[PDB]
Amino acid sequence: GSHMTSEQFEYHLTGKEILEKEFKTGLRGYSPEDVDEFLDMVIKDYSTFTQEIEALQAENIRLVQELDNA
Amino acid sequence: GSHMTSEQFEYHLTGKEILEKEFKTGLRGYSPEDVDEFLDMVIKDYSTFTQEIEALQAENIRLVQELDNAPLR
Ligand code: NI
Numbered sequence: 001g002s003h004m005t006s007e008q009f010e011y012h013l014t015g016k017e018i019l020e021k022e023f024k025t026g027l028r029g030y031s032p033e034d035v036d037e038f039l040d041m042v043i044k045d046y047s048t049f050t051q052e053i054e055a056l057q058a059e060n061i062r063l064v065q066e067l068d069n070a
Numbered sequence: 071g072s073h074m075t076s077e078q079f080e081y082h083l084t085g086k087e088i089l090e091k092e093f094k095t096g097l098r099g100y101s102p103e104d105v106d107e108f109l110d111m112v113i114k115d116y117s118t119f120t121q122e123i124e125a126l127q128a129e130n131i132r133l134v135q136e137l138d139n140a141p142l143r
Contacts, residue, residue, distance in 0.1 A: 009122045012111035021108060029099025038091060041082035042112055049119040052079050056126040063133035070140040 015046040085116035 018039060025032075088109055095102075 007125070009118050011115050011118060013115055018112070023100035023104050023108075025098050026101050028095055028097065029101055030093035030105050031096050031099055034093050035100050035105055038088075038093075042088070045081055045083055045116070046119075048079050048081055049116075049123070052123055053119070053126065055078065056123060056130065059130055060126060060133070063130060063137060066137055066142075067133065067140060069142050070137075 013046075015043045015050075018043050018046065083116075085113045085120070088113050088116065 021039075023032075023035070091109075093099075093102075093105070
């Protein structure tokens with residue numbers, strides 16, 4: 001009967017891991033303030049990506065469950 | 071036939087921007103090698119997130135098309 005495919009998405013980091021990452025420092029290096037400001041945006045985007053996927057999964061569930069009554 | 075729209079989510083960066091970003095240097099900054107290796111994972115994750123979202127959006131559009139044509143009662 002009905003057969004679903006299965007796809008897997010592999011991620012390297014979590015927002016938490018980015019929040020908790022401590023870079024080593026050296027004689028010359030990237031401006032800590034500038035890197036921090038940039039990663040702040042990255043962490044926000046990880047949260048937003050996660051939320052949008054959750055929203056899209058819920059929308060998927062909504063549509064599938066409607067079709068349950070077809 | 072009638073439609074409404076929303077703008078639910080706000081993003082700050084693209085993967086391309088993270089690949090291309092050039093940081094100012096200074097005394098006692100973060101290890102460039104360490105930061106670059108870290109951001110490489112971020113870049114790959116942005117691409118994967120983006121792919122997953124676009125795949126779900128395509129799937130949902132297929133399902134809405136199916137539902138448009140489906141009798142329920
Ligand atoms: Ni079968």
